[PDB]
Structure formats: structure tokens, C-alpha cells
Design an enzyme around this catalytic site. Structure first.
Site, short mmCIF file in Angstrom:
data_model
loop_
_atom_site.label_atom_id
_atom_site.label_comp_id
_atom_site.label_asym_id
_atom_site.label_seq_id
_atom_site.Cartn_x
_atom_site.Cartn_y
_atom_site.Cartn_z
N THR A 60 1.02 -1.42 0.25
CA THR A 60 0.41 0.42 -0.28
C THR A 60 1.22 1.72 0.14
O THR A 60 0.20 2.44 -0.27
CB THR A 60 -0.84 0.22 0.93
OG1 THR A 60 0.14 0.55 2.56
CG2 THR A 60 -2.01 -1.53 1.19
N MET A 61 2.21 1.54 -0.21
CA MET A 61 2.94 2.64 0.29
C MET A 61 2.28 3.19 1.66
O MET A 61 3.10 4.64 1.37
CB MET A 61 2.61 2.89 -1.24
CG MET A 61 3.47 2.45 -1.90
SD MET A 61 3.39 3.71 -3.34
CE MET A 61 2.08 3.23 -4.99
N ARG A 62 1.79 2.66 2.66
CA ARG A 62 1.36 3.47 3.71
C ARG A 62 3.00 3.58 4.55
O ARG A 62 2.80 4.46 5.01
CB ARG A 62 0.19 3.26 4.13
CG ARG A 62 0.34 3.90 5.62
CD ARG A 62 -1.43 2.95 6.13
NE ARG A 62 -2.14 3.91 7.19
CZ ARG A 62 -1.75 3.68 8.16
NH1 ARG A 62 -0.43 3.17 8.80
NH2 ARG A 62 -2.44 4.36 9.38
N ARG A 63 3.56 2.99 5.03
CA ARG A 63 4.36 2.29 6.30
C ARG A 63 5.76 1.74 4.81
O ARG A 63 4.64 0.98 4.33
CB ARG A 63 3.82 2.37 7.59
CG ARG A 63 2.61 3.11 7.92
CD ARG A 63 3.37 4.10 8.47
NE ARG A 63 1.85 4.78 9.65
CZ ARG A 63 1.72 5.57 8.52
NH1 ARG A 63 1.26 6.76 6.99
NH2 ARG A 63 0.88 5.95 9.72
#
Ligand SMILES: [Fe+2]
Ligand SMILES: [Fe+2]
Ligand SMILES: [Fe+2]
Lengths: 271, 271, 271
Positions: B72-75
Site C-alpha cells: 500500500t506504500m503507507r508505511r
């Protein structure tokens, strides 16, 4: 099956004529040209000229005062140069519109009204031909959230179906193509008629009695697209939605348009 | 109108200077460079070097321990080869971060903090200049859900506007371009300043007093993008949202960010 | 780390064998071939032939009676020619299916049942290996909303991860590629096994103990894709979702699949 895009006279439909043919069309094709619906080349021309004028001779300031803070193409003007150099657009609805001047507003309010009237009337026939009574009644269903978009130009658009009840299209080489009988057919202009695409909401509300045909733009010209979209609270049966192809992830037996599509209108869905 | 991307000193804005100019900028352009905001090339450099290092000299194992189970490229870290061979990314937020080591965490926590502080401060000025009081108050509004994404590279990105309150961008040929006065202008690096893009939430919360400019990547380099995003429960007036261009499908007079965008953050919207 | 796509015998997993290896696989790779799961080339062949037949020798009328009014590819047949001349598809679920004839229904109901049985069984092992108990219990979780899609053909597909619990794939040059150890690896056919991709729901329900690998189609052939998707009311912890990478915009401590993804099933997410 004849893969011809049929033509229907709104007046004749209102008179109760061609009901079998109309039902078959809605079921097998989901698109048709509509005549005698108060929409001709003349009206289109009037709005056509005054908007084109604005596009070409309108300053960056005048266009600014009619440009929304967010580029949603919902209302007003929309566009090493920009994309207007690829296509310009003008949108409007029942309210909160952005008009550049007096003569523009008069012509466009009149134009929108005619488009809305025709859209509701044909949608009304779609409901009657399929013996459909929307939850909450017909008139509450048709007093909705239409969106009119006019685009002036200088593949192009992937295949999709509309998520409207019905979509009315007027235009000025055949660009638009729609799938009919398993093949993309040409949808040329008819100065005497408006092209009608049935949308997914017609499919849903009628319990799957209406097809929502896929279409796209094949590789200057203008197009006027009028989306007759339901209100956020339009309600329908979940089990019924599942019966006609909708891959819904809805808990419960009933749901609203908002529950299904979310908090922002989505006009099309790629296919 | 001057199509120049203006520059503002955060300190000067906090001092009450250039209020007319700032308002006009927000309304007519929605973007500007921000100086004296605690963010310079030095800080960027420090975080820049330690992350680049990890990208180049980091093993597949070390990177694994800092890679989320869902891309998700969130963290954490994000990528016949893969797409990291096209671009690598590192993301973080206020919590639940994935740090590869001691020195990395110290530098990046510090970097994030400065970015968050600057973002909230400029956002605070955007609210004051437009006389805006978010439902629930300013501080509750700004104590939100930011997302910082750093990307290291070896058209590119379609035109879109951000759905953040404000987005802060630092970078190291001019790649980034933004629409100003009806034309995509260059947005070169300024070692002394951070580039600020106003997002759709600024437009919404201020009742349409702020423009959310479209932008994209024109055809090695790194970019640090900081999205100041509202909380899921951020609440706003539906009729007001409709007044400034939002094509909302929301029943009722009030709604939340979650009601509007859905259950997953959406950072951009193509235009 | 060995970047080899492992193979597991369902029977052996049910017997409690290779538990460490299975856990590691789920965590580090999120994909594997599954043998002894009641799915072989024979079964595929039977359904394969009867559907291909329909595609080639099926009339436009017969196909019409098995085509949904909306081109959602949820149930039934899906397609200057059309896109079927690029690829044809046939979908089905637990109910509301569209079958062209007697022999077709018998073969495909049987085929679907086996796919569903295998999917639930491997999903059951994924839950046990990770010591996971879904809110509401395992069986309620697995009695869900599967979708089986068969596609017959004459880059191709962008990189994405699936949003299913697990996805079972059978196929007939290696087209499919999946990211393993930071590189897209080939996923050739195995007449003796089914390819299993873990989806985002496996990641979510197990609290991030399962990876959801990105995959795509590299540049005739058929593919059978079976999505084991949760019910709309599947419930999970929001804070937990945030802990494993989900960029959720959900207020509150608990949410449903419907709250997160919306009112329409979404099977994939580009990465
Ligand atoms: Fe359309
Ligand atoms: Fe952006
Ligand atoms: Fe997939």
C-alpha cells in the site's frame, strides 16, 4: 437479431405505440435514437455557438470567474499549454451553475431545461414499458441529480457503460461507437434526434429488464452529454440487484444509491 | 493575471503580512513556495542520504523486515527485476512506522516532525486567511492523518489534483509541472523552500476559497511528498460542498470525510 | 532467501505437516502451488472443453440468453468486432448463475463446487497456521461470496494484488508473473496443482501474518480464476488494520468489509 440502432418517436411512445418493439430494444440493446422530444439541431446550434464563442473569444479572466476551485467538471468551465488545447468543457445542473453572461445563461438554462425534460420523459417511458415503479414512486425518482456536459474538441476513450438512468447525447467520420449484437456499431449524428444510452440505474430499477450498453470513442467536433442520475437516497432491493448482475457488497435487503456507489457520483464504469 | 508561482515566508504570514496577496494566491492559484518554515536542503539532505543508502546498500532481508504485507506504500519500503528498478519508495506517518535501524529512525522521525509541523502551520494560515473555522475547531482538524512518501528514481504521471488539505513537496530539467493561469508551469527545486499544493480538502473546508491545482510529471531524482490529510470524522456541510464544485452523492445536510471518500484514503483524483 | 514458489499438499497441511514452512511461505511470499486438493487437469479439461465450445460454436442468440444486462463479468458470458475478439469470459458464483444448457450446468456446477471446496480448505489452513479466529468464527467467515471467472484468449495487465482471502488459479511461454523476493517470477502451469495467491483479506484477518503478492501478465491460452471473497459484513479491528499497512479512513474501532471497500466488490488493487 437485427443489429440496427432503432429510432423511436417520444410522442408515439407516450401514445402507447411500439411497446413490444421498445421493450425488446431496451432488453436486447439498451440504446436508440429519440425523435420528437423537443430537441433538434436548432436548439443545439444556439447553445453550441454561444459556448464555442466563449471557448475561442473568452478571456482567461472571464473563464476564471466561471471555473470551479476544484477541477471536477461538475459546473462551469473546464480544461507548455493545457488540456483545453485538447478539449474544453462546460457543465451545469439544476442549481449552483456558473454562467459567463446574460445571453449565455438564458440560452443554456433553456437548453438544459429541454434536455432534462426530454430525459425524464423518455426515462418515464422506460419505466412504464417495463412496468416499473421505483421505491418511493416515479416522480420522486425522476426529480433527481442530472449533469449536463458540453465538450468542444480541437483510442480516445476506453469502453465503458454509464451509471445513469439514461444518458442523452447530441453531437455535431463517426466518433462514437456502441456495442450492438456483439460488435461496436457507429452512432452518427441525427440533426432530428438525440441518441439515448440506457445506464446501469435503468438496469437496476427495472430489475434487469434494460441493458446498459458499452460504448467508446473510436480513432473538430462537439458533444453534449446529459446524465439523468438518481438521488443519493434512491433505494433498491439488494437481492434483486444481485439477480441482474450487480456484484454488490451490501449487507441487508435494501440499499441506497449512496450505499452502492459511495459519497461521490461516478458516471461511468469501464468494461 | 501574473502566472508566476508566488513565494511566501511562513514567518511573515504568521506576522499578518501579505494577507491580500496570500488570499488571492489561494483563490487564483492554490500553490506557492514556502520559505522560513523550518525546512531546508540541509534537513532534506540528511534524510535523503540515509534512505538512499538503504535503497542502494540495503539487503533484500533488511528491506523485507521493513516491507508491509500489503503493497500500500503507507508505511515502510515499497518497490526479470521489479519496479524498484523504476523507482523505490519509503513511507511513514505519526505511528506504526517501519524503521531499518537506529540512525535511520532518529533522522526520519525528526524529518517527519518538521514536515508535519510546517504542514499544520501553513494549513493554519490557509484557514486564518480565509476566515475558516472547521467544524470541531482548528486544532482538532489539524491533528490528523498525515502521510509522508519519499521516492528515489533511477508521460510519467497523469494530471490530477490532491485530496489533501495541503501537500508539501521537496525535491532534488524540471520534472514537476502545475497548471497556473490555464497552462502547465515548471516547478523547479528551491533549496530554500518547500513547494505547497493546496488540496481538495482546503477547497472544501474553506467553502471554495481555495483552488486545488492540477499537476503532473513531465517527460535520477528524489521527491518527498507530505500529505496533510483530515481525520475520517472530519465533518462538513453537504450543500456547501455542492456550492464549490463537489459532485457529491450524499443524502442529508452534513457528512464526514469517510462518508465522502469511503473507507480507504484516496490521495489524488485525476483531472 | 530462496525465491522459489513453494508447493504444498493440502492433505499434508491438513495432517499438520510443514507448519513452519507454510507459515514462512505465507509471511514471506504469500503464494504457492497446492496439490492434492481435488483439482487436476482432468476436471479443468472437462469444463474447459464445454465452455470453449460455447465460445466458438455458440450462436449470438444462445450467448445473449446467458449475458447479463450489465457487463459486470459477475455471472454469465462477457466479451468492427468486439473485445471477445481479444478475450471471452464466463463467470459464476454460488447462485444466480446463467447456464447455456444441461451438460454445461452439470459440469460447471461440479467444477465450481470443487474450486470453492479447495479454496475454503486452503483458506482454512491459512487461518490455522497463523492461529487466526475471524470475528464471528471460521465457518461463518468462509461461507462467503466467491466469484469464479474463466477466460479464453485468442503489457497485458498492470501489477496489482488481489483483495480476496485467497485466489485459486488454473491455466493451460509463461504468461503470469508474481513478485517473489523483490522480482517478478514465472508462474507456469502445473497440471497436478492449482496456483494460490493470498489476497489482502488474508493479510487483514490474520493481523498481517500473510503477504498479498503483486502480480501481472507478461508480454492462445485460458485461465480460471477463483476469488474467495468475504461477506459484506465481515468485521475487523480498525487499529489492527492500520498496524499491517492498510491506509484506512475509518472512524471507530471496528469496521466491516463493506465499510472499507464500499458497496461494490473490488477484486484487485493496482500497486
Ligand atoms: Fe458514456
Ligand atoms: Fe499530487
Ligand atoms: Fe489477481
Amino acid at each position: 437479431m437485427d443489429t440496427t440502432v432503432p429510432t423511436f418517436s417520444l410522442a408515439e411512445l407516450q401514445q402507447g405505440l411500439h411497446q413490444d418493439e421498445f421493450r425488446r430494444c431496451l432488453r436486447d440493446k439498451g440504446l436508440f435514437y429519440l425523435t420528437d422530444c423537443g430537441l433538434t439541431d436548432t436548439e443545439l446550434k444556439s447553445a453550441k455557438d454561444i459556448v464555442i464563442d466563449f471557448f475561442e473569444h473568452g478571456s482567461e479572466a472571464e473563464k476564471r470567474a466561471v471555473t470551479s476551485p476544484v477541477p471536477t467538471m461538475r459546473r462551469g468551465f473546464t480544461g507548455t499549454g493545457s488540456y483545453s488545447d485538447y478539449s474544453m468543457c462546460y457543465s451545469m445542473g439544476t442549481a449552483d451553475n456558473l454562467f459567463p453572461s446574460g445571453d449565455f445563461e438564458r440560452i443554456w438554462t433553456q437548453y438544459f431545461d429541454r434536455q432534462y425534460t426530454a430525459s425524464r420523459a423518455v426515462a418515464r417511458e422506460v419505466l412504464r414499458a417495463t412496468g416499473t415503479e421505483p421505491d418511493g414512486g416515479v416522480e420522486a425518482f425522476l426529480d433527481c441529480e442530472p449533469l449536463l456536459r458540453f465538450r468542444y474538441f480541437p483510442l480516445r476513450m476506453a469502453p465503458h457503460y454509464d451509471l445513469s438512468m439514461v444518458t442523452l447525447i447530441q453531437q455535431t467520420f463517426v466518433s462514437l461507437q456502441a456495442e450492438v449484437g456483439g460488435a461496436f456499431t457507429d452512432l452518427p449524428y441525427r440533426p432530428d434526434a438525440v441518441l439515448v444510452f440506457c445506464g446501469a440505474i435503468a438496469t437496476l430499477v427495472t430489475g434487469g429488464q434494460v441493458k446498459a450498453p458499452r460504448h467508446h470513442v473510436a480513432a473538430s467536433r462537439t458533444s453534449s452529454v446529459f446524465f439523468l442520475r438518481p438521488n443519493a437516497d434512491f433505494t433498491f432491493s439488494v437481492p434483486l440487484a444481485r439477480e441482474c448482475g450487480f456484484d454488490v457488497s451490501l449487507d441487508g435487503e435494501t440499499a441506497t444509491f449512496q450505499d452502492w456507489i459511495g459519497g461521490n457520483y461516478v458516471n461511468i464504469r469501464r468494461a
